[PDB]
Amino acid sequence: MEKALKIDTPQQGSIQDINHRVWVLQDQTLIAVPRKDRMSPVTIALISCRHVETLEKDRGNPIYLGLNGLNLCLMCAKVGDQPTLQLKEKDIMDLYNQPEPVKSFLFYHSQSGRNSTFESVAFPGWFIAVSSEGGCPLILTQELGKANTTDFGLTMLF
């Protein structure tokens, strides 16, 4: 069970509100559709990792998030070259329910001036990119040349 917090309840909402970038799971990949007739709204569920007792603390607080609709959540994968995101098949309420804080799916949450960032716990050095620039797919980046969006908020509701 959790220690003593006031944000244990799952907070589900969205991120499209940032720049009208709707997110759609398309052919096992999340892609932003900022201008498409075939768009589909989704939801983003965010919850703390109650089994943080065995996790790191120095680097920052690891938590988990997922899409609410087709049973899909963040998941680190590798293209046999470098790490990548795979939000397709994963459950968030399960990792919360059972003491299985799988770092490969957890992300350290941070903030830097009204902005929030999320770094891969199993593989630090990379940040999730919300893709609010042109309309790129949801991927992880380690360094960007002001071409992606790593620094942003969320529109999670409770």
Side-chain angles (χ1 to χ4, degrees):
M1 67 168 279
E2 278 289 14
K3 229 80 179 181
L5 74 177
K6 63 179 67 182
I7 56 116
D8 170 74
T9 34
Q11 38 270 289
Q12 64 230 291
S14 57
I15 321 173
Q16 176 263 16
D17 272 65
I18 297 189
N19 214 261
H20 294 128
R21 310 261 168 294
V22 172
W23 323 122
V24 182
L25 173 128
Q26 257 189 89
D27 196 32
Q28 287 143 113
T29 314
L30 279 180
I31 343 165
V33 292
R35 50 129 66 191
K36 230 188 203 303
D37 309 276
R38 212 54 152 138
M39 70 173 100
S40 190
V42 300
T43 332
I44 304 293
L46 176 141
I47 319 83
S48 28
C49 292
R50 71 171 198 151
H51 204 257
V52 275
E53 200 153 79
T54 198
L55 285 295
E56 276 264 73
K57 293 117 180 194
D58 276 26
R59 62 207 296 175
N61 289 295
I63 67 93
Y64 189 36
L65 165 154
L67 336 171
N68 211 41
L70 238 159
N71 180 241
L72 345 83
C73 313
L74 294 153
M75 220 211 66
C76 290
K78 202 151 166 264
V79 297
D81 210 349
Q82 47 146 65
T84 50
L85 255 174
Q86 267 193 6
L87 325 80
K88 302 109 79 288
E89 63 211 65
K90 243 305 104 186
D91 216 331
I92 43 183
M93 210 88 220
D94 219 80
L95 301 195
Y96 162 86
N97 176 63
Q98 50 167 217
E100 274 263 89
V102 176
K103 293 184 233 195
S104 328
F105 319 143
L106 305 200
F107 299 75
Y108 142 47
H109 68 275
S110 201
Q111 45 154 26
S112 337
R114 287 186 292 260
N115 114 68
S116 303
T117 20
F118 295 93
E119 157 172 275
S120 286
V121 180
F123 295 104
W126 291 266
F127 285 106
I128 308 176
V130 291
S131 309
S132 290
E133 277 286 9
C136 279
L138 299 197
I139 53 67
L140 304 149
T141 166
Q142 39 160 55
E143 38 163 303
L144 57 85
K146 218 311 179 58
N148 229 308
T149 21
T150 42
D151 92 264
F152 252 128
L154 225 75
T155 330
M156 66 210 181
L157 313 169
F158 47 82

